[PDB]
RNA sequence: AGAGGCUUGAUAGUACUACCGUAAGUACAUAAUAUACAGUCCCAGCAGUAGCGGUUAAACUAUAGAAGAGUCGAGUAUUAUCCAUACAUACCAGGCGUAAAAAGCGUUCAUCCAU
């Protein structure tokens, strides 16, 4: 998308995979919790627990273009 | 008529707790009518969504117009009020083709649903 800027199809197919990653964090913390502290350390990736229902409020729900925060440093949050 | 207020053009099934065809104010006296008739004639009026009134229609006024043809009755009737009678105030018990009603196309939060 960097070097490609007028292609505004995959734009919708990039928020299905963000999303997919999602969901299968949620699985896998229910199913083993030591596996999924390790995985997130190597890959360098903001490791997030489930154990409470995410509130309505934007101002502290939850975000998963952010979930690299460690390697991007410029899609974290805004005003 | 021991006694008054309504209707007198069409339309309305006119209430239901016992009895549920298992019986007479049954017959004589004791049988009749008002879509007969009178006045005005798009003028005066009545009425209920629909309407009538010009040449005379049971639709307007009038019952010494005949001991009024009817329903109530010592009251009757108009307006007003509410969850305004299945105009279903819609779980029981209405919809989303043409008729009033499905967001331009899609990934996510919460809730609900699933084997």
Known sequence: ???????QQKK???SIWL???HRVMKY??????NLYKYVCQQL?????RFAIPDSRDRQ???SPIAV?????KF???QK
């Not at 896998?28 to 919790?33: A, E, G, I, S, W």
């Not at 360098?44 to 997030?48: E, S």
């Open 12 to 14: 919708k197919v990039l």
């Open 60 to 62: 502290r729900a939850i």
């Open 1 to 7: 998308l960097l070097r490609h800027f007028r292609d």
């Open 44 to 48: 360098r990736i903001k490791c997030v």
């Open 75 to 77: 899609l974290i949050r």
């Open 68 to 72: 690299d925060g460690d390697r991007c």
């Open 28 to 33: 896998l913390y229910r199913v083993d919790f």
């Open 19 to 21: 999303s997919r990653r």
